[PDB]
Design a protein around this ligand. Sequence first.
Ligand SMILES: [Zn+2]
Ligand SMILES: [Zn+2]
Lengths: 261, 213
Amino acid sequence: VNLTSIKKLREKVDDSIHRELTDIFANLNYVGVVDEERRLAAIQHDLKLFLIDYGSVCYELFYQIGLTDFANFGKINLQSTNVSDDIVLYNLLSEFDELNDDASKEKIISKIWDMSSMLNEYYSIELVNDGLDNDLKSVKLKSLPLLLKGYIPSLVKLPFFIYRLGKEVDWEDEQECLDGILREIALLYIPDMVPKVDTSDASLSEDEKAQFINRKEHISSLLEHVLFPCIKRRFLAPRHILKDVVEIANLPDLYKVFERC
Amino acid sequence: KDELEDFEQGEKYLTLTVSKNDFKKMEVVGQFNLGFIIVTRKVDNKYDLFIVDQHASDEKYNFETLQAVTVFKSQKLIIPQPVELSELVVLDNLPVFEKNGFKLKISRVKLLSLPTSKQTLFDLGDFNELIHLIKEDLRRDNIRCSKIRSMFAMRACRSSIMIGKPLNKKTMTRVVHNLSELDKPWNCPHGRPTMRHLMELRDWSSFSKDYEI
Ligand SMILES: [Zn+2]
Ligand SMILES: [Zn+2]
C-alpha cells in the first residue's frame, strides 16, 4: 500500500505489542467456551489454565487483519437471487428509535453513499443503489470484506456498523477516517454475544431451545476450528489486553490435591 | 501435614455448594491437560467453574456400580457349616450375603456357599466382618466385606478412563452427569478427589464496544 496513513497505524500496533502475552497466544492449547454471553474462552498455556475474553481478542485480531490486507480484501458477496433478502441501509437504521425521522437516517446514508467509491476500493464494502441515484432509502450493501477464510461474520450487528460508520467515523481526517473504518469492520466481525437460555425451564418453547443449542454449537465450532487457530498463528497481543487474560489454575497447585490412586 | 487443611475445605465446600441435581445441569467446557474436565454450573444467579479428574470421577461411578449390582462368585460347600450370633435378625433380613457369595439356609444359621477368587482366600472372619459392617451402615444393599471392596476398587481403577486419554464432549458429559447418581461423590475408592471448585464467575464486565452507540 502506497499510503502514509496505514503505515502510521501499523507502527502504532507494533508499539503496543506485548512480547510475553503474544507468546501465550502463539502457544495456546484450546480448551473450550466458558460463556457465550460474556464471551469467555478457556485456553491452556504450558502449566496454566487461562480465561480469555475472545470479544477483546477477535477485536484486535480482525483489526490487525484489516490493517494488513488494507486495499486488497476479498469479498463476501451478500446478494442472492432473492431480492427480498437484500440489505437496505434505511431498513437497518430503523432499529434506532433515536433516528426518529427519515431525514436523520438519510443523513447517515448520505455520508456513507458519497464515500462508496473508496469504501469499495480500500475496504471491499460495496454499496449499490437499486432505483434512481438520489434514492437513499434504496441504498444497499452488496459486499463486505473477507477477512478470514472459513469465516463469515454474523450480520446481527449490521445496524451498529452502519450507525457507527455514519456517526462515529471522522471522515475529515485521513488517518482517523482509515483507523475508524478498520475499527468498525473489526467490531462487526467479533462473534455475537449469545445470551444464556434455561433448558430446564418448561415455560420456554421447544423451538427456542434447539435454536439456543444451535447458536451454542456454531460458536464452539467457530472458536475451535476457525478463530483460535488464526489467533494462535498470527495474533499480536497489545498490552492493553492483560486485563482480558486471567490465570485461573496451575498444574503444580492442582497436582497437590488431585493424585493417583 | 498442615497442608491437608486446603484439601478438607475443598470437600467441605462441595458438600454444601453441589447437590445431586447440580451435576445434571453442569456443562462441559472442554478437556484440560488430557486429565481434567472443566465444567460450568450456572444456577440460580450463581455461576461457577469446577475441575473434574477424568479417572477418579469415572472410577467412583464404576466402583459404586460394582458395589451395588455385582453378585460375587461362590464355592458350593461339600458339607454345610453352622454359626452362632445373638444379630441373628440382620442375616435373616438381608440378601446382601447372597451378593457377597454367601448362600444361606434359614441362633441356627447354615452356610451353603462361601465366596471364591483365584487371587484370595475367604473364611468365616469375612462373613462376621460383613455381619459387623451392616451394624455401621444409609443404604445397606451396597455393603461389601473389605476383601471384595478392595477387588472392586481395583476392577474400577483398571476399567475406568485413563489420564492422558483424549475425550470428546459426549463422553465428558456422561462422566460428570453420572456423578448425580451417587451420594457425596467427592472421592474415588482410594480417597483421591474426583472434583473441586475452580472459581465463581461473579462480576466480569467483558468487552462490549461492538453493541455500544
Ligand atoms: Zn482411585
Ligand atoms: Zn484409579
